[PDB]
Amino acid sequence: QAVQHVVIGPGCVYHGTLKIHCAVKSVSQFLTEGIIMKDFSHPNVLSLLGICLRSEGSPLVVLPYMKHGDLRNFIRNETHNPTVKDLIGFGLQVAKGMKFLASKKFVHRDLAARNCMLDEKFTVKVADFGLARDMLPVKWTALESLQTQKFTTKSDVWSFGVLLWELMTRGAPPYPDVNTFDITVYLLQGRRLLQPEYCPDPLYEVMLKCWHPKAEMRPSFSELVSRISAIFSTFIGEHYVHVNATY
């Protein structure tokens, strides 16, 4: 009876109706996960509409349809014309979504532009969590977490810095000439992702702070929302961001 308000009625995802447009994904823990995921509610977090075990379901996770799909594909699309302002605004929304999740003691572990969705208002939702979770991810993972398989909000912060880099390169693969088994050795040489051409200096400083070698010295998502909202406020949407030819 704790899962009833999560329940609705009369793998991979497919379309769906109720009208409201949705995405439908396809036993005690499933009903538990419904209730927990149902408790997360923030404009920059993908909400669960409800679940279907009936009858028998499969089961079925029903999520709001995101008109514009994943953030990575959206910024990569050559027919899109984002400004510095737009891209930073997307980063600011992810940071707000993560500040909420961190407040709920939730550790994402797979924060990446591919795992964020965009609705018809271009509101960014952090997704790929709860029932909707699916597939290492080496290139987004904090150094300590690669080394110890332990994940924290401070390791999400490192991931968020890589996501900002994605944003500012319009979806370039991070560390392209680097193979995933070798990323630990590469970083321990004293290396970070390079400053994208259309990345403002203060935002590259923010990325570098997100990648601080001491997890405790990284900014919280709350300090990131504050810092990024200030940077965002200085732009007016006159700087068009192009794609690098090498990526």
Ligand SMILES: O=C(NCCN1CCOCC1)Nc1nc2ccc(Sc3nnc4ccc(-c5ccc(F)cc5)nn34)cc2s1
């Ligand atoms: O795809 C669209 N819109 C069409 C976008 N088009 C594409 C063609 O270009 C024109 C614009 N809406 C959708 N809403 C939803 C709502 C929920 C879910 S499941 C889920 N839960 N967490 C995550 C996290 C990531 C992914 C994911 C990753 C890579 C991808 F590639 C696609 C989706 N899924 N995911 C799927 C969809 S898909």
